[PDB]
Each structure stands twice: as structure tokens, then as C-alpha cells.
Symmetry: C2
Subunit: 104 residues, 2 copies
Amino acid sequence: DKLTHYRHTIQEIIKKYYDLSNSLPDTVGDRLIIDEQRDQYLWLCCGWDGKKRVQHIILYLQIQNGKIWIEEDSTNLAIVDEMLVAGIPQTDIILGFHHPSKRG
Amino acid sequence: DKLTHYRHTIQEIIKKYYDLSNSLPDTVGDRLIIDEQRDQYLWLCCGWDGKKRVQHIILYLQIQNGKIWIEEDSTNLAIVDEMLVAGIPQTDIILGFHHPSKRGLTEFAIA
């Protein structure tokens, strides 16, 4: 019930930001990797910038122990603002990217 | 038929090496991200090594234009042998981690 809502919200949010970024197969291109079974939601870019290999995680979220872990954020917390608007309590949102020491 | 076989093959391969390497939430741990709808298959590790943030792609495969793109590999091409044994021809395997101009040096596809 709660997890269904949390899943729907993450997918809509990640899809919004992915589409906002992008409106040959080797130029740096964005890829969305959504796994509903494992609750893993990731947006990366991959390709070549001349001779330089590009392989960079832009946005990464997961659901574990009924909470949303923001592992990588490209939005300056705009995604967290959207989660709060979607009724997700802040205690169910963890900032994986900021060290455990700063949360307790 | 070609695509469904390729999907099954690369999902079976990614899970094999994933299980083979690792058989609570803040520690550096491995995560598998399979997207059959978009044909994106990824294995990464993520967490904290003390104050050090770890967020590293281990294995990344995608199916694009009827070909398997190995974008990141941790097996020193051991996964290629498994694909050839599954009847995937070398012309349908692209080493995305090799620069486009380097691909013709090996026995695999350029694009």
C-alpha cells in the first residue's frame, strides 16, 4: 500500500527529470534503468567525449526497509521537495549521499 | 526470438557473476538493477568506506539495435565466452568500454 505509492512516486519523479534533460550510439547519451522487483531506480549517462570515456550516475534511488534512499541527486533536493508534496514523510526519506554521522 | 534469447542470456550471465561475487544499508554493498522493458542490466556497489563515498559500476550491459553492448566489465572478458557458448555471434557483441576506433582490433562488432 505504502510501498506501492512510494514506487509510483519515485518512477514519476525520475522520469520527469530524465525527460527534462533530453526533452550516433557512442556520443554521451542518457539511460534510465528502472527495476520494480528490486526497487532500484537509476539514471546514468554513457558514451565517449572524443577519447574520454563517460560513465556517470546522475540520479539513483532505492527502496529498502520501507524507506527511500537518495543515493545520488542532480536536483539540489527538488526531488525531496516533490516527495514531501506526494505525502511521503521525511522520516521515510534518507539522504544516502550525506554521511550517516550527520543524520542521527 | 533473437531478442528474447539475448535477454535471457545476459540476465542469466549478470546474475551468475553477481551471485559468484557476493553469496546493514549504509555499508558498501552490491545492488543489481535489471530493466527488461528498456534492456538495461547493471550491477553496482554503493555505500561508505568510513568517510569515503563508494558508488561504482561493476558490470553494465545493454541491448541496443539488436546488439549486446558491454559498457563495463569486471570479468576480463569471461562474460564474452558465456555469450559465444549461448550462440550469440561476435558480430552482435560490442565492447562499449573500448573507444569506437579500437573495436575493429578485437574480433567483436564496432556498431
